[PDB]
Amino acid sequence: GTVNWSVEDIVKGINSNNLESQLQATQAARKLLSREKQPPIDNIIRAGLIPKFVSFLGKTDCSPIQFESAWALTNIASGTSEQTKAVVDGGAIPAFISLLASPHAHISEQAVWALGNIAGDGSAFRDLVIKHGAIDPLLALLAVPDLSTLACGYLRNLTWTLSNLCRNKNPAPPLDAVEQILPTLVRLLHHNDPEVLADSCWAISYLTDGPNERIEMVVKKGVVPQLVKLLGATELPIVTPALRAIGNIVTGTDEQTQKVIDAGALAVFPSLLTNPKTNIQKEATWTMSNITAGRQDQIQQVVNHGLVPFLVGVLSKADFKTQKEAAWAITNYTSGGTVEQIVYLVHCGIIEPLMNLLSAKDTKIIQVILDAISNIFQAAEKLGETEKLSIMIEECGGLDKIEALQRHENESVYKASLNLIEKYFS
Numbered sequence: 001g002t003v004n005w006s007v008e009d010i011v012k013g014i015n016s017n018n019l020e021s022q023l024q025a026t027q028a029a030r031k032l033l034s035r036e037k038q039p040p041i042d043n044i045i046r047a048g049l050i051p052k053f054v055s056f057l058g059k060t061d062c063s064p065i066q067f068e069s070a071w072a073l074t075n076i077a078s079g080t081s082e083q084t085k086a087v088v089d090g091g092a093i094p095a096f097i098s099l100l101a102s103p104h105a106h107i108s109e110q111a112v113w114a115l116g117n118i119a120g121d122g123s124a125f126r127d128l129v130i131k132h133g134a135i136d137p138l139l140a141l142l143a144v145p146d147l148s149t150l151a152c153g154y155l156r157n158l159t160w161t162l163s164n165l166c167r168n169k170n171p172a173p174p175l176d177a178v179e180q181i182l183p184t185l186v187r188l189l190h191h192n193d194p195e196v197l198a199d200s201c202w203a204i205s206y207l208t209d210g211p212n213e214r215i216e217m218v219v220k221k222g223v224v225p226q227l228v229k230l231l232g233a234t235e236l237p238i239v240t241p242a243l244r245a246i247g248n249i250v251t252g253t254d255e256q257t258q259k260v261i262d263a264g265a266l267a268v269f270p271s272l273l274t275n276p277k278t279n280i281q282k283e284a285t286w287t288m289s290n291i292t293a294g295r296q297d298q299i300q301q302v303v304n305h306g307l308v309p310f311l312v313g314v315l316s317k318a319d320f321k322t323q324k325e326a327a328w329a330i331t332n333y334t335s336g337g338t339v340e341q342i343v344y345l346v347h348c349g350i351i352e353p354l355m356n357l358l359s360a361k362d363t364k365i366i367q368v369i370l371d372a373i374s375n376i377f378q379a380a381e382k383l384g385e386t387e388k389l390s391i392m393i394e395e396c397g398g399l400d401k402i403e404a405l406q407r408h409e410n411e412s413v414y415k416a417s418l419n420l421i422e423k424y425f426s
């Protein structure tokens with residue numbers, strides 16, 4: 001009986017002095033805003049309905065209209081940024097926080113979902129939600145001895161909303177709020193529900209997307225072994241953020257990187273570096289590029305796990321963005337590796353695919369490769385084997401690729417390749 005109302009009818013209903021008529025119009029409004037094709041959010045907004053919906057949130061005496069208006073507002077707040085703003089400007093945030101305490105689960109859950117949409121909109125709304133004190137009652141809802149006694153959908157919404165409080169940058173969330181949330185998050189990260197695990201991983205991946213101090217704050221909570229385990233999951237919705245998170249951690253200090261290696265991450269990388277999903281392969285290689293920028297003993301652990309041939313593989317054939325990542329991994333490896341580790345690199349076949357990418361119409365990857373070639377010559381210099389390396393590069397057609405770079409637009413390149421020609425090619 002609340003199917004297909006017009007906005008004018010809804011307004012008439014909501015403007016009556018009759019709580020039941022209001023409830024009926026609100027429900028009608030909810031159903032409109034729920035329809036799949038082009039819900040008329042903006043018409044609803046233009047009709048001045050948000051303030052009325054928000055005031056309906058306070059009707060403790062009429063829980064069904066609390067629920068319908070929460071749902072209606074939620075549909076609106078899950079739209080665009082201006083639509084979300086309209087919900088925030090109607091005073092929704094404290095009214096939703098009050099509803100977290102509702103004795104009716106379906107109402108509390110709706111409030112959880114609404115705050116998640118508002119906080120997920122941007123840094124400023126996220127921080128406004130935190131300032132209105134959302135975190136304490138959100139965490140209080142998860143304060144049970146075993147998470148398994150909570151309804152599955154309920155727990156998924158809470159996790160999702162928690163992950164939005166961790167999301168976005170400029171600024172990152174307040175340090176205080178991260179610390180408040182982190183222990184619950186570590187807990188959710190050990191729960192056995194794929195979606196809760198996915199969203200927990202996303203949350204950790206956001207918190208580790210920053211300066212080493214923020215990375216530290218997560219890593220000191222001991223999540224890395226669990227991340228590595230999730231890194232080995234079969235579900236792509238779990239692997240993807242676990243790898244993003246692991247990728248962020250290895251952009252940190254050598255000590256933070258070492259915890260990733262100690263947890264056994266490198267054992268998962270043969271499958272990641274050959275993963276059929278392009279973005280996994282790409283982020284796996286990025287991750288390697290940060291590990292090969294570590295200490296020589298960390299480069300050595302890459303060698304020991306048999307990962308150099310997989311780096312040669314990615315460099316040889318892959319999506320171009322992934323190959324760019326592999327080039328970095330190589331330059332970083334050659335930059336910091338021992339002479340013996342660089343010799344090993346060449347013996348694995350790095351030279352030919354390295355040269356084939358000198359044909360890439362991209363300035364940065366050329367600089368990166370030319371830099372790597374230079375590092376390898378510097379290793380050959382310490383062994384007096386510069387000439388043998390020269391013959392190697394020449395025979396796989398690499399020399400012609402380098403002379404052609406003499407004839408190149410950018411001159412950071414141009415001149416790097418001429419340094420190479422003069423110095424190592426008669």
Ligand SMILES: C[C@@H](O)[C@H](NC(=O)CNC(=O)[C@H](CCCCN)NCc1ccc(-c2cccnc2)cc1)[C@@H](O)N[C@H](Cc1ccccc1)C(N)=O
Pocket residue numbers: 250251252253254257282283286289290291293294325328332
């Ligand atoms: C831009 C650059 O500053 C960010 N990436 C880093 O790895 C930063 N790391 C360092 O500077 C280390 C610290 C040493 C760490 C010690 N363990 N020094 C050696 C080093 C130098 C250069 C590279 C390099 C540069 C460019 C590309 N690939 C690798 C890697 C290591 C950027 O790529 N971030 C991603 C982008 C992305 C994420 C996922 C997929 C695709 C892209 C993101 N936030 O989404």
